[PDB]
Write a protein that binds this ligand. Structure first.
Ligand SMILES: CCCCCCCCCCCCCCCCCC(=O)OC[C@H](COP(=O)([O-])OCC(O)COP(=O)([O-])OC[C@@H](COC(=O)CCCCCCCCCCCCCCCCC)OC(=O)CCCCCCCCCCCCCCCCC)OC(=O)CCCCCCCCCCCCCCCCC
Ligand SMILES: CCCCCCCCCCCCCCCCCC(=O)OC[C@H](COP(=O)([O-])OCC(O)COP(=O)([O-])OC[C@@H](COC(=O)CCCCCCCCCCCCCCCCC)OC(=O)CCCCCCCCCCCCCCCCC)OC(=O)CCCCCCCCCCCCCCCCC
Lengths: 31, 110, 66
């Protein structure tokens, strides 16, 4: 069977989350 | 930094009233959380494109200071377009209300 | 004074002569669950704790903004 659907790139390449920084402690700021 | 031309084009579409009706129709069956998440995802996609593509690719504006010069130019453009315009208006306001330099006048002597 | 309300400590020189002084751990770990994490090697965190920690992989710029 042939491919006809228009495949977007978001289904393939997922971007990393960089807008809000990482929390290596995995704990909230008040804690 | 990248896609400044696309950003100008986005602003032009936003200021177009036909696009306001288009957005009105697109807002049917839609939530504020969804809109906010979409915008945040768009911004993240931009910054992630930068973080990834800077490792191997160089734009036409590449220079020994890198993207620092582009970001400085963005800041300077914003400053001269918005803040200096506001300063002009404030200057004319103060000059009509008190005279030139009226906001820095000394208190009335007692 | 009686001695009931005396100073609840001994000077560092006398401890050093007694062989008793400890210098370390500006910080501490209150709970044994938190103390034995690096020695367990197989469950440093329980499963419930793991899924609770997975909620804080990033800081919340939304909450910061609000
Ligand atoms: C006036 C300048 C001073 C501004 C005010 C003072 C502010 C000072 C602060 C400066 C801070 C700068 C901001 C830095 C942030 C980063 C911006 C950025 O790099 O991307 C810019 C952006 C490119 O974004 P991009 O993501 O890199 O996309 C590239 C494309 O894929 C296209 O791919 P490409 O490979 O085909 O081309 C890549 C690029 C290549 O660009 C270059 O390499 C430079 C071009 C030639 C080399 C020499 C450059 C300098 C002298 C010639 C150019 C004079 C204009 C000065 C332009 C400043 C930038 C060098 O092409 C351009 O971007 C065109 C730029 C030249 C526009 C010429 C317009 C002519 C009308 C103006 C009259 C003539 C000048 C009057 C005298 C002004 C003297 C100050 O350029 C645009 O403005 C987009 C234009 C879209 C068309 C809009 C409709 C036409 C209107 C034209 C005016 C455009 C607005 C700028 C006004 C300048 C003319 C008044
Ligand atoms: C004008 C300021 C007025 C106050 C003076 C300022 C004093 C504070 C200075 C702080 C300066 C720090 C610098 C900014 C931090 C930046 C980074 C950051 O915050 O990370 C993201 C971080 C997000 O946290 P996360 O790690 O993602 O955790 C998210 C969890 O998923 C969330 O889930 P969860 O499980 O954690 O809990 C959910 C929820 C709620 O928690 C729950 O689990 C449920 C329980 C909630 C119920 C009770 C609510 C709390 C108490 C009531 C609060 C409101 C009204 C009080 C009314 C009184 C009674 C009627 O969480 C919260 O509500 C978070 C608590 C927010 C408290 C702030 C964080 C503690 C910082 C220590 C500040 C020191 C103050 C001293 C304390 C007072 C004396 C002991 O942001 C924050 O949450 C904190 C907000 C920052 C406050 C805004 C202050 C402005 C900062 C200016 C900086 C820019 C400087 C230049 C200005 C010029 C610009 C052009």
């Amino acid at each position: 069977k042939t491919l006809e659907r228009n495949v977007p790139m978001k289904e393939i390449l997922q971007p990393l989350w960089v807008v809000e920084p990482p929390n290596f402690l995995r704990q909230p700021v008040w804690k | 930094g990248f896609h400044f031309q696309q950003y100008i084009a986005m602003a032009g579409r936003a200021i177009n009233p036909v696009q306001w009706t288009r957005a009105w129709r697109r807002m049917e069956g839609k939530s504020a959380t969804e809109v906010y998440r979409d915008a945040l995802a768009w911004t993240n996609n931009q910054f992630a494109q930068i973080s990834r593509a800077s490792q191997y690719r160089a734009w036409w504006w590449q220079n020994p200071l890198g993207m620092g010069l582009v970001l400085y130019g963005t800041y300077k453009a914003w400053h001269m377009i918005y803040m200096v315009r506001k300063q002009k208006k404030t200057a004319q306001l103060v000059a009509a209300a008190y005279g030139q330099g009226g906001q820095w006048l000394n208190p009335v002597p007692r | 004074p009686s001695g009931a309300y005396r100073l609840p400590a001994v000077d560092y020189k006398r401890q050093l002569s007694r062989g008793t002084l400890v210098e370390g751990a500006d910080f501490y770990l209150p709970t044994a669950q938190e103390q034995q994490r690096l020695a367990r090697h197989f469950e440093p965190y329980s499963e419930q704790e793991q899924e609770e920690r997975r909620k804080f992989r990033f800081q919340s710029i939304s909450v910061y903004l609000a």
